[PDB]
Symmetry: D2
Subunit: 431 residues, 4 copies
């Protein structure tokens, strides 16, 4: 950590790393992150899981880990004594099953603690003592319980000691009787009590998938929630997650987020803007209008001045046409279309880096290219957004100063004429 | 850890300290020590007790600690709760006074862990989940259990990371129920489980007390147990600690000793032969004989050679008188008396380094001066044994090469006679 | 050290980074690198220079650094000293101005050592005692020396301690006399002695410049040396650096490369294929042929298979057209152009990982596009070479599975035809 | 070191270690200690030397070590080139001899550095660059030099880094010429420039010897110098040390000291009052008077009160006889004799702990036993001074509360009467 005092200047993307670090170091205690890792992960990828969690804990951060026991107990060691795996409301365990669950959750818990230590970091075994539960479901569900309180003494002790606290889903009733707590109801209680700035689900998949097969980078629940639930291509398992994640995020401050990655990406996910998994925030709504009057042109001047680093030319704003503008509620990202020969033309796309990390730039760019299937725009040849534009474009012409892109399905010869006019437009920002 | 291999060879004793460091660095995990510590010490001397256990840790050792709830739940947190301290069997807990118990011992437990971390050491909170217990008492005692099995899972994980396992006296049952376990029976089944090299009692009292209020340095149960049980000065409570202490040591190897101290004296107690408290071993028998033919002169000569670093002069043995010889069953410590102008004289006091530390040098010495109230003996002025002789003498005369000691108050005018005769005597050893 | 093996495998590239780590950890001692850093660099950017070298140290590498004293002694401490900057042979120092040099470079030396230590890294001041030198100039220059022997005493011990050996350009003679050594001959004699895997030049300029002022990424002396010296755009001073760079590389193994950078890009330059500066290797020869029979279709069949991860389809080679083939002497990098409607088309561009990193892919590509100013080609949409193709193309069209590029500014209406033929084309590779 | 935040409470002598630690930690820079170790030590005992030095440097301390190369150069690598080892004034080195001394002191320097680092600590090789010397002794002495200036640039760097700086006796003239510096003249030169709190000589023997063969613990130059020089049992070699040592301390503040131990003793030496070798201070003069008026009875009451923790009984002073009083100039240690049945009797012996650490208690006690060959005194049986008394006694009788000692050659029958009177003296102090 002292040997990471100025080990913050050189990695393959080194400057926004600093800022993500100096933000998770707003510790309070263990209010940094509640990381839920499934039973499947500790079995099929324990080293990678460990290195990833242990990496954090050397750079100062101390997550609170909750692990399940899916494959471990719900199979490998509870089909063994031919007990068989009945699943009622969401999980039944008769009194006979209890001592096996006890011994196999504790075994995974310690398996992980040691893995973290052996990987360079520090962990703290907390199988029990956190979850105080009620039992009301006796003949209904058996010995499964619902959290009434969270003792955070053991967890706090761990943070002060610089140790990732490792929780196992074992609970205790008021009068000390043991109980099996389901891993989801457990995470919820903990996220509630701790109010973490970050909730991470480490899965083997590495994030929710979109209609095309790709990983869904950002989800902005304010605009995207309805669209997803309603969709035909979203399978039952994705909707329960989203509905759950949203239930979690509605119980946290706006600054809290959820990430869904695989252990290997976890650092990429937490320490760069672009991320490396699925980010899900409550997010913010957007205005789609063609009435320039309504927009706060001052805040836009600011947005452009910050995003591009240079200001818009004198009297660019009141002289501007506007075919449609898309601006996020906070004026931290915006897309502004004009018209060029009757073609929709993207005149400004401005997104502050911190807005880019929350997925707002994509929230804006998607509503924009949804209105404009056939889109033409340009970008300086040095612009770092060029890689993003090129993944989104369908064609491009490249000169020594500007590069014109286009979207839609038009044979190159069709857009050859509008392209030349875009190269000959005056600069709307100096330098 | 590694930054410790030197700290020590320069100490006030730094020669036999090397000896103890290696002896104790036969880890086998947590088989180094079991350290019972009453509730009274954690309350009244948390900082020093924490520094003690920290010290052990920095030097590379990892003890298993067990704390009780004397001046805590059996006072403080149930004297202002109106349950009234129920004492029947030896420690009764109703169901009502059970969730009181859980959190009283749990608070103590973390206080200890942080205090140890505060003082520079590594420790690990293991509040519950070790003692698997049978609830045999029903209504007569309440919610008290007796360890049928010991889950050393959590203990092991601590050790590997080099941590002191701070256990609490809370237990499970076959079917979950949180149950109270009294400290001593906990320590018994735990010592039986771990087979530690060293059982340590930390009390404020600082040791065990002898007839005249001094600290009883050592007890050798082979020879001393019967004596200590039938002496009237030994109070009924000391006749209890001793019996129970016997039960533990009868369940350990002969190499395993029990020590009783206070936190500030623990290091001196562990890392010196001299000790600093009350060592109690199973030890070994001793013969007291006047017939020389009934001894093993071969083993004695080995002993003399090994102990003094020089061998006995020619024919010393065939020529040796022998008023009374006191040799311990293993010939690792022996005292042999002759006669001198009628007075009893000590010709040989031979103890091997290791034997001195098991209190065998003392055992033999104590039996000899019980036979020889009036005793004369001598010692080269560089015998490091001089300090102990001095502490045992009633007088001394000093010349350059030898020093004559005597003992048993006998009017220093008639001792001028026997002192001179003692200086005159031919050597019986060379160099 | 141990707390480092993971930091990186999660990076934006974290896969080719493992390789160079493995490569740079063929220790021997200080044979990883020799890093010359000019005087102007320690004065104007001391912190950045130190974070760069500190980073290396944390990663487990220990470069041998050699610093000069441009804007220090050859200015600062002798422009208000009246000795007047004598420059004749190439670096003159009289007898009087020798103790000025001594305390100037050493001050510089410790400014560097402490700065490195401040940024978290380990370093060792070696102001003198490495360079045993011959006073070859007499009265013509004064007290300037030529390295006869390199004493690696201090350097080896630095390395062993995980330290950057910070050498200064001061040397002895056979009989003691302290003598001045100019930085370049020092680096030459040092590289010859150390035979490092890597020679690195740190300047503020950040690399070497091409015809149009951009940074020249790679130089392959085999093909490029003659071309560059007879180039009129390569200035007389740049023609000197290259000459000396050859001389260093001709005395090193073929695996020993040279980099020229600025401190901020040092990590990227060393741990990625793409680099971030100017690489210079001895490299290898390249054939350019239009005759298919002058090629080894077996060896190309391997190259292609290894580059794409898939094998060329059956009979592809016997059937292959071939306008021009560009294959490097070791068959690790090749481009094969065919014909398509009169246009030159690139059927295969195959570069192996190591070859990409030695700048051989660049070598082939550049020789290919100098023969084919007007070029058409395609690439699957998930080819990571796409980014590079994009930086080189003048246009591109994108469908789901493939993407067509073209090159050489030629009015996007006449290329609409040959693009279709390119998408139409049957694959020549499978999976 | 953080793991020595509270690792300062338990060792075989735990309370005065802290105080020495918090005193050497007044560093300024490298002003703590200049440690001279002869060539003989690095040859015949390098591991022990290193651990001894590595311990300092891990507890915060940064000594500056100067080593010679006695056995190394005066043999190991310089009888080899048949040069013969001539010693004029005190050391001659012809021009031919220079390059061997260089390579063999340097080889010794790194041998020491690597040894320390392998032993846990941190060091900084400074074979050359510290001693700037003059040569005026050309054909007389050859290439030997006497320090004219001390560059501490390298030494301060080592201190800041927490590195024991390891200096070799190699010098440099104004014009860079190499030179052989004698190890004694260098230490003289270095102590002058650094003004250390401590000057330590690490030798194989382990401290100066007294007339009896034992190690001489204290020398109080104000009182002991003249007495030693003059003595018959002090050989010429002991005289040259004493002359040199005095020459050093006379160039340091009164607070400086010299210790002469062996590496194995060095910690005991610096961190306890008793030490473990020979300590030498400029010290302070003494009053031996029989006029009670002249003594400052105010300052004496304070002394007794501090040294004993209890005050002298009401009217002990004005009723007190005083046969002779021995008081150190600062009233920090004192011996007061009265008369008892015509025998000299030591009524008070009082020494503040810190004065016992500067050797004043022994200075006071030495003039005392010189005045009183036949001395009787007493001391409580629990007094830690008893072991010192017993080493100094000629006889002693012991009861359960007090113990009477005596000096001189008197058969028990001669002192049996007075001893009884010493047992019956009133306590002249309360509690
Ligand atoms: N899938 C993503 N785009 N994630 C972006 C993550 C942004 C930010 N570093 C965070 O951890 O919250
Ligand atoms: N009370 C005593 N004198 N104990 C001696 C202790 C010797 C050794 N350190 C041990 O723990 O067994
Ligand atoms: N200027 C460049 N393209 N350099 C490439 C660097 C490749 C490799 N990492 C090396 O250091 O040799
Ligand atoms: N030979 C002695 N008695 N030395 C005493 C040393 C006292 C003190 N610890 C010091 O280092 O200065």
């Amino acid at each position: 950590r002292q040997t990471i005092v100025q080990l913050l200047s050189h990695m393959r993307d080194g400057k926004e790393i600093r800022e993500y670090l100096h933000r998770f170091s707003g510790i309070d205690q263990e209010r940094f992150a509640v990381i839920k890792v499934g039973g499947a992960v500790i079995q099929d990828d324990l080293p990678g899981l460990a290195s990833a969690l242990a990496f954090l804990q050397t750079v100062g951060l101390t997550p609170v880990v909750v692990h399940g026991g899916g494959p471990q107990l719900d199979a490998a060691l509870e089909a063994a004594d031919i007990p068989t795996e009945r699943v009622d409301g969401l999980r039944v365990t008769r009194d006979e099953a209890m001592p096996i669950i006890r011994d196999t959750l504790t075994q995974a818990n310690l398996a992980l603690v040691d893995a973290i230590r052996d990987a360079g970091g520090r962990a703290a075994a907390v199988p029990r003592g956190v979850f105080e539960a009620d039992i009301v479901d006796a003949d209904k569900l058996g010995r499964v319980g619902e959290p009434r309180h969270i003792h955070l003494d053991l967890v706090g002790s761990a943070a002060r000691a610089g140790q990732a606290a490792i929780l196992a889903c074992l609970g205790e009733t008021p009068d000390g009787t043991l109980v099996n707590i389901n891993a989801d109801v457990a995470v919820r209680a903990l996220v509630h009590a701790l109010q973490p700035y970050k909730v991470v689900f480490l899965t083997g998949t590495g994030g929710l998938l979109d209609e095309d097969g790709d990983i869904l980078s950002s989800i902005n629940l304010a605009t995207d929630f309805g669209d997803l639930m309603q969709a035909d291509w979203v399978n039952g398992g994705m909707r329960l997650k989203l509905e759950e994640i949203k239930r979690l995020l509605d119980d946290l401050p706006l600054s809290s987020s959820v990430s869904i990655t695989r252990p290997s990406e976890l650092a990429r996910e937490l320490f760069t803007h672009a991320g490396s998994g699925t980010l899900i925030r409550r997010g913010e709504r957007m205005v789609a209008t063609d009435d320039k009057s309504s927009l706060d042109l001052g805040r836009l001047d600011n947005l452009v001045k910050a995003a591009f680093g240079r200001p818009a030319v004198e009297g660019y704003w009141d002289r501007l046409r506007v075919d449609r503008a898309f601006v996020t509620e906070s004026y931290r990202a915006a897309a502004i279309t004009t018209r060029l020969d009757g073609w929709v033309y993207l005149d400004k796309f401005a997104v502050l880096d911190d807005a880019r990390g929350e997925g707002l730039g994509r929230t804006v760019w998607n509503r924009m290219v949804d209105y404009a299937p056939q889109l033409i725009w340009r970008s300086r040849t040095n612009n770092p957004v060029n890689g993003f534009y090129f993944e989104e474009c369908d064609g491009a012409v490249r000169r020594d100063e500007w590069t014109v892109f286009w979207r839609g399905e038009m044979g190159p010869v069709e857009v050859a004429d509008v392209v030349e006019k875009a190269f000959a437009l005056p600069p709307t920002l100096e330098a």
